[PDB]
Amino acid sequence: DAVVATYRLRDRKDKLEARAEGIAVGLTIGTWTDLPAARKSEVAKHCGRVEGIRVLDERPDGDVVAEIDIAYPVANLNGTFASLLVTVFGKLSMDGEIRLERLQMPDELVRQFPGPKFGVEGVRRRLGAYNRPLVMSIFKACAGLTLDELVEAFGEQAEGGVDLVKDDEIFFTEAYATPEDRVRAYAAKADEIAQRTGRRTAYAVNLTGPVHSLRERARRLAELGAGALLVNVVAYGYDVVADLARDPDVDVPILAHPAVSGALYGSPNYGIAADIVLGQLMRLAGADIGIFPSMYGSVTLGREATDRLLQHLRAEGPHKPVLPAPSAGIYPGLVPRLYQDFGVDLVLNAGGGIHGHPGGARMGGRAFFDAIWAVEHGVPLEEAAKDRPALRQALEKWG
Amino acid sequence: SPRDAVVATYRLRDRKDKLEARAEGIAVGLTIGTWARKSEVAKHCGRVEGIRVLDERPDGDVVAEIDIAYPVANLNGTFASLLVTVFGKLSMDGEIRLERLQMPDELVRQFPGPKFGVEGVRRRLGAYNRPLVMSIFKACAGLTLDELVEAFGEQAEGGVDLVKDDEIFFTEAYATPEDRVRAYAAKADEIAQRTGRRTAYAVNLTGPVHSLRERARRLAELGAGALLVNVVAYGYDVVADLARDPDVDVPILAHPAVSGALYGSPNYGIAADIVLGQLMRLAGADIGIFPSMYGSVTLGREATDRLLQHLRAEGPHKPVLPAPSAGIYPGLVPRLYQDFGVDLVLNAGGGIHGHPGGARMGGRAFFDAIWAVEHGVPLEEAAKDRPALRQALEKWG
Ligand SMILES: [Ca+2]
Ligand SMILES: [Ca+2]
Ligand SMILES: [Ca+2]
Ligand SMILES: [Ca+2]
Numbered sequence: 081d082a083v084v085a086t087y088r089l090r091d092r093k094d095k096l097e098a099r100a101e102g103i104a105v106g107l108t109i110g111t112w113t114d115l116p117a118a119r120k121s122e123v124a125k126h127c128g129r130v131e132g133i134r135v136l137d138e139r140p141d142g143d144v145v146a147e148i149d150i151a152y153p154v155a156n157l158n159g160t161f162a163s164l165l166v167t168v169f170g171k172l173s174m175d176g177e178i179r180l181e182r183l184q185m186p187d188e189l190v191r192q193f194p195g196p197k198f199g200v201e202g203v204r205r206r207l208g209a210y211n212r213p214l215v216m217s218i219f220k221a222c223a224g225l226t227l228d229e230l231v232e233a234f235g236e237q238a239e240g241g242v243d244l245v246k247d248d249e250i251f252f253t254e255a256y257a258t259p260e261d262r263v264r265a266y267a268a269k270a271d272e273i274a275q276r277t278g279r280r281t282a283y284a285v286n287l288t289g290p291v292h293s294l295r296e297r298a299r300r301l302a303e304l305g306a307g308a309l310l311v312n313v314v315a316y317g318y319d320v321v322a323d324l325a326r327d328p329d330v331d332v333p334i335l336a337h338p339a340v341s342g343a344l345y346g347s348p349n350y351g352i353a354a355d356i357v358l359g360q361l362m363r364l365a366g367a368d369i370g371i372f373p374s375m376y377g378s379v380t381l382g383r384e385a386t387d388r389l390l391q392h393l394r395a396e397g398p399h400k401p402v403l404p405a406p407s408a409g410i411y412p413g414l415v416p417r418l419y420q421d422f423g424v425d426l427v428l429n430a431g432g433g434i435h436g437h438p439g440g441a442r443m444g445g446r447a448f449f450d451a452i453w454a455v456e457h458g459v460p461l462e463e464a465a466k467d468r469p470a471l472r473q474a475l476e477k478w479g
Numbered sequence: 480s481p482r483d484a485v486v487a488t489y490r491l492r493d494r495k496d497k498l499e500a501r502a503e504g505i506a507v508g509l510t511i512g513t514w515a516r517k518s519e520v521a522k523h524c525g526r527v528e529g530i531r532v533l534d535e536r537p538d539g540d541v542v543a544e545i546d547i548a549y550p551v552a553n554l555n556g557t558f559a560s561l562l563v564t565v566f567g568k569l570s571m572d573g574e575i576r577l578e579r580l581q582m583p584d585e586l587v588r589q590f591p592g593p594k595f596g597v598e599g600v601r602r603r604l605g606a607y608n609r610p611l612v613m614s615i616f617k618a619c620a621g622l623t624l625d626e627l628v629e630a631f632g633e634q635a636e637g638g639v640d641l642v643k644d645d646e647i648f649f650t651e652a653y654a655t656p657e658d659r660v661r662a663y664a665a666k667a668d669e670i671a672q673r674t675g676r677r678t679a680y681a682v683n684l685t686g687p688v689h690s691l692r693e694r695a696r697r698l699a700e701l702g703a704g705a706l707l708v709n710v711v712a713y714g715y716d717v718v719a720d721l722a723r724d725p726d727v728d729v730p731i732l733a734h735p736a737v738s739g740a741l742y743g744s745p746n747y748g749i750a751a752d753i754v755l756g757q758l759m760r761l762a763g764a765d766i767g768i769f770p771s772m773y774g775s776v777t778l779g780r781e782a783t784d785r786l787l788q789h790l791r792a793e794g795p796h797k798p799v800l801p802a803p804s805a806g807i808y809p810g811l812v813p814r815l816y817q818d819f820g821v822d823l824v825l826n827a828g829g830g831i832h833g834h835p836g837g838a839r840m841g842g843r844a845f846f847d848a849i850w851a852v853e854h855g856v857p858l859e860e861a862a863k864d865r866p867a868l869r870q871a872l873e874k875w876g
């Protein structure tokens with residue numbers, strides 16, 4: 081009947097027991113009150129409890145690193161990320177060297193959050209893409225460009241057959257092309273291009289502006305034919321995103337971008353674990369596709385967090401599963417490894433992989449489809465690339 | 480700091496010879512992405528405005544600061560555009576920390592700022608020329624409305640300016656926020672004919688985002704003295720809408736909950752003065768709660784001085800009242816006067832409820848300490864005719 085949080089913290093050994101008891105009482109009932117007999121027993125049900133204390137290491141300076149588990153009765157929450165976060169890591173987040181490592185959430189509480197509107201199966205159905213990883217391209221340049229220039233850049237990507245093209249997450253200025261004008265325009269270009277490719281390439285548009293008009297804008301963008309909404313979830317807040325995922329009129333998948341999240345998880349000894357920030361919380365908030373740093377870029381999340389992250393996105397539960405879109409180091413040569421890591425339920429999140437291709441974005445996209453083909457037919461890339469110049473060039477530049 | 484750009488300073492670790500390349504790539508990559516149309520788009524391109532080496536490692540690494548200028552033209556007036564730009568993708572690039580933002584007035588004015596500020600809060604409460612005294616509920620979840628009314632009464636009987644919900648008070652099963660405000664307002668008026676002061680009530684503002692503004696208005700109209708807001712948990716833009724709304728005609732009290740997850744580490748995240756100072760004033764906090772220098776864990780001297788400066792520096796927006804927390808007891812009041820001057824909220828939890836004579840005397844002991852300071856009489860001397868202050872000195876010194 082409670083959320084059980086696990087914290088990693090540094091302190092002195094003989095303080096651990098009192099510090100844990102103070103947390104369990106102070107962050108639930110606050111303190112015991114001079115009430116009559118019946119009232120105490122009733123109030124007791126709102127009180128937290130210490131579930132476990134585990135010393136991980138003893139330092140020569142006398143400090144210990146320990147894990148503490150605290151149970152917070154669900155009856156004190158109100159079904160929002162605010163209530164959850166302020167309770168489990170609100171004031172506690174400031175208490176020196178301490179980090180939230182795990183949240184075990186009871187079914188009753190999980191079900192008060194919306195979860196993905198579409199999930200894996202609904203994204204596939206919307207885009208008509210089955211039995212293969214999806215391919216996504218990212219705009220190399222946005223700010224400063226005219227709508228016409230933007231359209232051409234969209235066309236180049238779509239001519240490579242990609243399933244999805246996303247705005248760069250930094251695209252905020254509406255001086256040259258408003259989000260609504262971009263959705264309309266890229267729709268038409270996509271229609272033209274599908275006549276050669278056989279696929280209408282979808283557009284993930286950055287969801288931006290003031291909170292109070294965000295849900296109405298999300299609705300308009302859906303109505304205008306957006307393929308997905310790109311949302312900087314952590315910048316806006318999880319509850320903000322939750323309302324979007326819950327609203328039936330926001331009839332479009334959410335593409336969760338991790339911007340700002342590293343400020344929470346980057347440190348090994350402070351903050352909140354990356355699998356919670358980018359995994360657990362994202363699925364609850366309603367991301368249909370989740371972008372997170374891959375194990376193949378310069379800076380990873382590390383093995384352990386990355387596995388826990390994926391399991392958060394995929395674990396059997398009351399909400400739909402989320403498509404992982406791991407970022408950085410994504411090239412056609414990595415495709416077979418990516419099949420092994422994630423299976424077919426995967427978004428190939430390409431950026432430099434598309435635009436860095438010697439033959440242009442068009443070729444950059446074809447390359448990924450060539451590797452997808454090779455895998456599906458048990459053909460080695462190097463072998464497949466004998467008949468496919470796109471893959472050939474991609475194998476040349478990046479291995 | 481350029482008139483046309485926000486300049487962010489980052490502390491980071493990298494190879495020495497890599498700094499220029501990394502800085503240049505940031506400047507371009509986070510503004511235009513990549514390259515006679517040039518001079519047109521050049522207006523949106525960022526630039527490197529400083530590279531400073533702080534410490535050389537034997538592993539060939541350096542700790543350094545880099546300053547990047549981000550054209551204001553690329554932003555849209557929201558915290559989301561600001562944060563995602565200066566520390567979105569960048570926040571995940573290993574050991575790097577956002578240390579400073581120098582923002583032009585043209586950008587600052589895109590944000591609401593405090594509706595009341597220091598001067599507005601004093602006029603609303605009618606409390607001038609002295610620190611304000613604020614008490615926090617010691618227990619909330621699971622008590623009944625009547626038990627909660629009695630609790631509020633005890634704190635108000637001490638004559639305090641302000642009583643705030645505990646920031647963890649979410650459950651509405653026993654007493655709704657609407658119900659508490661109605662009942663506490665009625666209690667405060669009963670007590671004011673004995674204390675001569677109508678103790679205001681800062682209520683925890685809670686619930687889904689889509690109905691928060693409507694609720695803020697209702698609570699203001701019902702007579703809340705202020706709204707307690709877990710700003711970091713909800714998001715700064717959520718809170719900016721509150722500060723901009725004329726019908727949310729009550730002060731905002733910013734609680735720092737969740738903030739430590741951003742600033743706690745020395746080598747990652749965002750500096751505490753930015754999170755709890757610079758950003759709070761822009762978002763519209765009238766009173767800002769942050770860890771004092773007198774509890775177990777502080778922000779450190781330097782951060783604290785920077786934070787207080789963000790709250791007070793003359794600029795487009797009104798100044799914010801500081802409410803330093805932890806270790807706040809009557810015995811500390813002279814020191815707090817020296818550090819903060821009279822524009823200060825004395826933010827007591829344990830200092831009030833932990834008093835030997837209960838909540839009434841706890842608050843009374845704080846006004847005793849204020850009297851002693853105002854008159855240049857040492858607390859030890861003032862306690863001779865002031866039992867509430869005497870008992871506080873006995874317990875905490
Ligand atoms: Ca649902
Ligand atoms: Ca990007
Ligand atoms: Ca204003
Ligand atoms: Ca509190």
Ligand SMILES: [Cl-]
Binds near residue numbers: 746747
């Ligand atoms: Cl650290």
